[PDB]
């Protein structure tokens, strides 16, 4: 009906991939942080330069 | 006992149609009445005509089933 | 329909190109069906009414078939009207 | 959360913001919440329910050509 | 300060005449208020012949609950009446000037 | 013991890991290439999750992304050549010494083992998220509260419980039906006949992969 | 008793469509007259024509069932 | 065993029409209610008339099943 | 007596579809006439050829059942 | 095994109608509420009444299935 | 007599759906004509190419009925 | 093997109704959302109630089929 | 004759869904044309795509029937 | 061989409803998006879950067909 | 020959539903396109994915039919 | 099987057509992302 070893093999690999993605999510997190920080810096810089 | 299943099939397959028929009759009638309740009798008359025809078909099924029953 | 619009009937007899060739045969079949359909319609709608009123006179003969008799009167009147109406409508569409 | 313009030819009565408005459309009464899809409609005699922050003020409208965006 | 209800007696009559084929076209002559000092008579077309304005270019898609044809037939008369009311008020201002 | 689907699942996981390593090896502004495509896919997934629920968009986002990537890899491998043609042996190529010619590459989704893991994970995550900020209210039936809502809550609770199992069964059925349709097209004609079905197979696989993540996010939003 | 099942099916099947057709015709006619009251006198004729077409199909089923019985 | 199958069909079949007609009735009634709230009593009365007409066939099927039982 | 069941199934299943078809035809025709009273002379032509084709479809099954009879 | 087939017929056929009826009811009620939110209470009450009717008609088959099983 | 019931089922089930198809086609055509009579020349042609395809399955059913 | 046919019939016939019901529910809910998105939180609740009812009927059928299996 | 009834059932049932689908396709396309003649070829392409899909399903049914027969 | 016809019946009757439901869902969603383009974000997110709910019944049918096979 | 009728029933029932679903999808999509040709590609993408989902059930039924045959 | 080779060839042809179509949308998305990141970096550079 179901292979007991197949479930363990899938679960371990999925957990390892999720753990890598969490570390790899810091890379996407940094990319999004740079993308948002461009506008964050601009929101202050434009008004400061105008004044 | 095949008379029993014959009667059941007759009743069922003669009743499934008229139910939807009367349902559509009443839905259309109430929708039209809500659109303009000013004209009421000249709509309810045809609503009841349709209901009578559909129930007549249902009773045709009922009586032909009771013949076997 | 032969007297008016000429004896052509190319719309229902035969067509050269286009789907009208396929349409024409179906029109001829339906036209042939029409008289048999009308005959069976009227015959059944009266004979079944007779059967129903008789067999309802068999079971609980009294006071139950009062609405069904009136309904059967309505059925007969509607059949008489629609036979004429469909005859004239078929005549008009054949003229067209 | 949307600005409603109660515009009459004689004058503009209200150009304020309204939480909820009910349109007495010809086909039947309709309600409008701020992000309604585009719509045009013909109003009828009845009550125009300017529901602004919980208070329903029924404005009598004899006709309308309400534009929604 | 006339009310739009006061113009109906003429505007509805003109629109009904146009609808019934009695009039094949409609015009209005009114005193345009160019300046506080300068006013000239003006001619305007009352058959719509609407302008392909930015709105006409605008492709915002709509929904017409009573129906597109019904909304059209109910809004064109009111648009014409609005045009006539605008002309009448313009003429009143030009009269006083 | 291990099955044929386990090897293909390991291959898909290894491919995903290699793609992630390649993308993260050179991270720079204005990506252009595999890294750019991966970033665009992740951004679209995040936008869809925010449309579903921005509060929990990043809550289980890594798990949903991993599941979607695994589903996409499995769907791609299912239509890839060599799957179901090479037989390990425990007229056909392995006719001599018959051993049923067990296929070398079996789709990970086409087995009830790997698919059930996704359902278990999704159900556990949904229940945990719902009960963390709702307590008894997450599973509360509202006994005789909203017109004896107890019955309404029951049927809804049963449907919610069956939802993850339903999704896993849907994925397994889709994968198995794609493989069986490919086999049927193989039997019907030798070449060029299976193009209409094979082309739609990849689209169906991608649609199912997106739908799994969308359904997980929407169920969590409902759980929230 | 296979004849019993035959006559049960001949009437049971064949009357499903007539009921839904009668309902659709009644709803359409009622809505049309609600929108267009003055054409009721002219369009009730076609309404009854369609209703009688549906009842004719039902009657074909009925008479065939009776013949089988 | 036929008797049991006939009971199942009589209960099962013959309730589909009186499962969809009632739904169409209620949908039309609520649509009219939303389109016209002030006509609630009239539309609800006609909705109950339709519901009674459909439940008549439903009860006919149920009692026929009980007789078959 | 399997031929009896054959004729019954033929007639029953050759009418449930055509009935709904005719219902949809003349309901759409009535609705269109109500919306557009001016155009009636030629739309009835298309309505009636549709009716004729649907009736021919039903009478095909009816004639097949009569042949089997 | 004929009683098992009877139970299957009772359960399966007893939900065809009520499911579609509940669906049509909820669709109509939700469409009306979107059209008119202020009539939500009455629409929901009538929706519950219709859904209760359909659910009872489904339970009519469910109890019979339980009795046979 | 399984041939008889076979032909019966073929004709009946080939008339079930195509009849509704004819009906929906004609209803849509009449609605379009009512909304726009001026598009008659093309819309009736579209209706005819549709109705031929819809009737094709009924013709197939009748052919199979006659073959049996 | 009549148990197998019973499971097949139950699973089939207990899904055809709820599927169409869920489809109608979702279509109506999406149409209402298009009409007004701000009523999403109120219409989604009843949409899920209807979906739960239909799925409960379907799961009842599936569970009875599993018991037979 | 089980092969004959199998072939007949295949052809007959396979013609239902495609027929109704083609009908709905043509009706929707025709209504769109009536509302928008300027998108004629663009919508006709999609109408033909849908008709081709339905015809492909019907051809699958017919070829299965031929293989059985 | 009754298992073969059992599984065929299961897979067959597991599809006639969910297909119609999914089609209604997609048609309603596309219509809503046409009415309101910018609300596609919240229309599609509900359309997909509706399609999943509708297809769950078909998936139950298929898995039961596999088990019977 | 029970396998033959099993295959026939499977193909027919797997063609009944998806045809209707595809038809409704295409009708709604073309209606939206006629209403809004400007988002033709956007709605047509949803149309294709819906058509694929609807055809999925037909493919499943045809696959099981081939397996039996 | 022997015919399975050509069947898998057709399936892989369909899969490769789908992959090429996705890569073309993927390439368009990458080009748009590069064009937008040009402005994103320009915002930070202008601020600095």
UniProtKB/Swiss-Prot annotation, chain A:
Compartments where located: Cell membrane
Coiled coil feature spans: none
Entry's transmembrane regions: 1-20
General function of this protein: F(1)F(0) ATP synthase produces ATP from ADP in the presence of a proton or sodium gradient. F-type ATPases consist of two structural domains, F(1) containing the extramembraneous catalytic core and F(0) containing the membrane proton channel, linked together by a central stalk and a peripheral stalk. During catalysis, ATP synthesis in the catalytic domain of F(1) is coupled via a rotary mechanism of the central stalk subunits to proton translocation.
Subunit structure: F-type ATPases have 2 components, F(1) - the catalytic core - and F(0) - the membrane proton channel. F(1) has five subunits: alpha(3), beta(3), gamma(1), delta(1), epsilon(1). F(0) has four main subunits: a(1), b(2) and c(10-14). The alpha and beta chains form an alternating ring which encloses part of the gamma chain. F(1) is attached to F(0) by a central stalk formed by the gamma and epsilon chains, while a peripheral stalk is formed by the delta and b chains.
Family: Belongs to the ATPase B chain family.
Protein name: ATP synthase subunit b
Organism: Chloroflexus aurantiacus (strain ATCC 29366 / DSM 635 / J-10-fl)
Lineage of producing organism: Bacteria, Bacillati, Chloroflexota, Chloroflexia, Chloroflexales
UniProtKB/Swiss-Prot annotation, chains B, G, H, I, J, L, M, N, O:
Presence of the UniProt keyword Transmembrane helix in the record: yes
Source superkingdom: Bacteria
UniProt KW keywords: ATP synthesis, Cell membrane, CF(0), Hydrogen ion transport, Ion transport, Lipid-binding, Membrane, Transmembrane, Transmembrane helix, Transport
Site-annotated residues for Reversibly protonated during proton transport: 55
Residues annotated as signal peptide: none
Transmembrane regions: 5-25, 48-68
InterPro entries per UniProt: ATP_synth_csu_bac/chlpt, ATP_synth_F0_csu, ATP_synth_F0_csu_DDCD_BS, ATP_synth_F0_csu_sf, ATPase_proteolipid_c-like_dom, F/V-ATP_Csub_sf
UniProt topology in membrane: Multi-pass membrane protein
GO biological process: proton motive force-driven ATP synthesis
Keyword Membrane on entry: yes
Gene Ontology CC: plasma membrane; proton-transporting ATP synthase complex; proton-transporting two-sector ATPase complex, proton-transporting domain
Localization of this protein: Cell membrane
Main localization category: membrane
Pfam families in the cross-refs: ATP-synt_C (PF00137)
Role, per record: F(1)F(0) ATP synthase produces ATP from ADP in the presence of a proton or sodium gradient. F-type ATPases consist of two structural domains, F(1) containing the extramembraneous catalytic core and F(0) containing the membrane proton channel, linked together by a central stalk and a peripheral stalk. During catalysis, ATP synthesis in the catalytic domain of F(1) is coupled via a rotary mechanism of the central stalk subunits to proton translocation.
Family: Belongs to the ATPase C chain family.
Protein name: ATP synthase subunit c
Lineage start: Bacteria, Bacillati, Chloroflexota, Chloroflexia, Chloroflexales
Swiss-Prot record, chain D:
Self-association state and partner proteins as the record states: F-type ATPases have 2 components, CF(1) - the catalytic core - and CF(0) - the membrane proton channel. CF(1) has five subunits: alpha(3), beta(3), gamma(1), delta(1), epsilon(1). CF(0) has three main subunits: a, b and c.
Molecular function via GO: ATP binding; proton-transporting ATP synthase activity, rotational mechanism
Recorded GO CC terms: plasma membrane; proton-transporting ATP synthase complex
Keyword tags: ATP synthesis, Cell membrane, CF(1), Hydrogen ion transport, Ion transport, Membrane, Transport
Lineage, broadest ranks: Bacteria, Bacillati, Chloroflexota, Chloroflexia, Chloroflexales
Record's function text: Produces ATP from ADP in the presence of a proton gradient across the membrane.
GO biological process: proton motive force-driven ATP synthesis
Keyword Cell wall biogenesis/degradation tagged: no
Part of the whole protein covered: 2 to 70 of 139
Record family assignment: Belongs to the ATPase epsilon chain family.
Record carries keyword Zinc: no
Signal peptide annotation: none
Protein name: ATP synthase epsilon chain
UniProt subcellular location: Cell membrane
Curated annotation (Swiss-Prot), chain E:
Keywords per UniProt: ATP synthesis, Cell membrane, CF(1), Hydrogen ion transport, Ion transport, Membrane, Transport
Residues shown, of full length: 146 to 242 of 290
A GO molecular function held by the record: proton-transporting ATP synthase activity, rotational mechanism
Cellular component, GO annotation: plasma membrane; proton-transporting ATP synthase complex
Family assignment from sequence similarity: Belongs to the ATPase gamma chain family.
The gene coding this protein: atpG
Subcellular location: Cell membrane
Keyword Transport belongs to the record: yes
Chief site of localization: membrane
Protein name from the UniProt record: ATP synthase gamma chain
Protein task: Produces ATP from ADP in the presence of a proton gradient across the membrane. The gamma chain is believed to be important in regulating ATPase activity and the flow of protons through the CF(0) complex.
GO biological process: proton motive force-driven ATP synthesis; proton motive force-driven plasma membrane ATP synthesis
Subunit structure: F-type ATPases have 2 components, CF(1) - the catalytic core - and CF(0) - the membrane proton channel. CF(1) has five subunits: alpha(3), beta(3), gamma(1), delta(1), epsilon(1). CF(0) has three main subunits: a, b and c.
């Amino acid at each position: 009906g179901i292979n007991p070893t197949l479930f363990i093999a899938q679960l371990i690999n999925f957990l390892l991939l999720i753990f890598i993605l969490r570390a790899l999510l810091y890379r996407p997190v940094m990319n999004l942080l740079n993308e948002r920080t461009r506008r964050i810096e601009e929101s202050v810089r434009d008004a400061e330069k105008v004044r | 006992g095949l008379n029993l299943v014959a009667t059941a099939l007759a009743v069922g397959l003669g009743a499934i149609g008229p139910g939807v028929g009367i349902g559509i009759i009443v839905s259309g009638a109430v929708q039209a009445i809500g659109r303009n309740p000013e004209i009421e009798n000249r709509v309810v008359t045809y609503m009841f005509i349709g209901i009578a025809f559909t129930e007549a078909l249902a009773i045709f099924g009922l009586v032909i089933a009771f013949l076997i029953g | 329909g032969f007297r008016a619009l000429g004896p052509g009937y190319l719309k229902k007899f035969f067509n050269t190109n286009g789907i009208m060739s396929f349409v024409g045969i179906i029109e001829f079949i339906s036209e042939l069906v029409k008289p048999f359909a009308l005959a069976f319609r009227l015959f059944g709608n009266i004979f079944a009414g007779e059967v129903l009123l008789v067999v309802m006179a068999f079971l609980v003969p009294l006071l139950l078939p009062l609405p069904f008799y009136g309904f059967e009167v309505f059925v007969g009147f509607i059949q008489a009207l629609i036979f004429a109406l469909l005859t004239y409508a078929f005549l008009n569409i054949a003229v067209t | 959360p949307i600005h409603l313009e109660i515009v009459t030819a004689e004058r503009v009565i209200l150009s304020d913001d309204v939480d909820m408005i009910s349109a007495p459309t010809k086909d039947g009464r309709v309600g409008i919440l701020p992000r309604h899809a585009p719509l045009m409609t013909i109003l009828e005699p009845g009550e125009l329910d300017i529901i602004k922050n919980g208070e329903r003020t029924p404005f009598a409208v004899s006709g309308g050509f309400m534009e929604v965006l | 300060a006339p009310k739009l209800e006061a113009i109906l007696g003429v505007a509805i009559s003109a629109i009904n005449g146009f609808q019934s084929g009695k009039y094949d076209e409609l015009y209005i002559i009114y005193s345009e208020f160019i300046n506080t000092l300068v006013q000239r008579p003006a001619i305007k077309q009352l058959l719509p012949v609407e302008s392909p304005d930015i709105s006409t270019t605008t492709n915002v898609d709509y929904t017409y609950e009573p129906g597109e044809e019904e909304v059209l037939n109910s809004i064109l008369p009111r648009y014409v009446e609005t045009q006539i009311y605008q002309a009448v008020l313009e003429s009143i201002a030009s009269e006083h000037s | 013991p291990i099955t044929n689907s386990f090897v293909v699942a390991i291959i898909i996981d290894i491919f995903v890991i290699a793609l992630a390593v390649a993308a993260t090896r050179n991270l720079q502004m204005v990506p252009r290439g595999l890294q750019n495509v991966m970033e665009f896919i992740l951004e679209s997934l995040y936008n869809l999750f925010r449309n579903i629920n921005a509060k929990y968009v990043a809550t289980a986002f890594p798990l949903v992304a991993t599941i979607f990537l695994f589903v996409l890899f499995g769907n791609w491998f299912g239509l890839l050549p060599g799957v179901g043609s090479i037989g390990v042996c425990h007229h056909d190529t392995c006719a001599a010494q018959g051993k049923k010619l067990v296929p070398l590459f079996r789709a990970p989704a086409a087995d009830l083992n790997f698919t059930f893991a996704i359902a278990v994970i999704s159900f556990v995550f949904i229940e945990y998220w719902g009960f963390r900020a709702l307590g008894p209210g997450y599973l509360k039936k509202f006994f005789n509260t909203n017109g004896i809502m107890s019955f309404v809550g029951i049927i809804e609770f049963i449907s919610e419980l069956v939802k993850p199992f339903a999704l896993a069964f849907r994925l397994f059925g889709n994968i198995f039906a794609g493989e069986v349709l490919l086999v049927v097209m193989a039997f019907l004609v030798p070449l060029l006949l299976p193009l209409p079905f094979y082309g739609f197979e990849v689209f169906v696989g991608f649609i199912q992969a997106l739908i799994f993540a969308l359904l997980t996010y929407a169920f969590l939003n409902i759980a929230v």
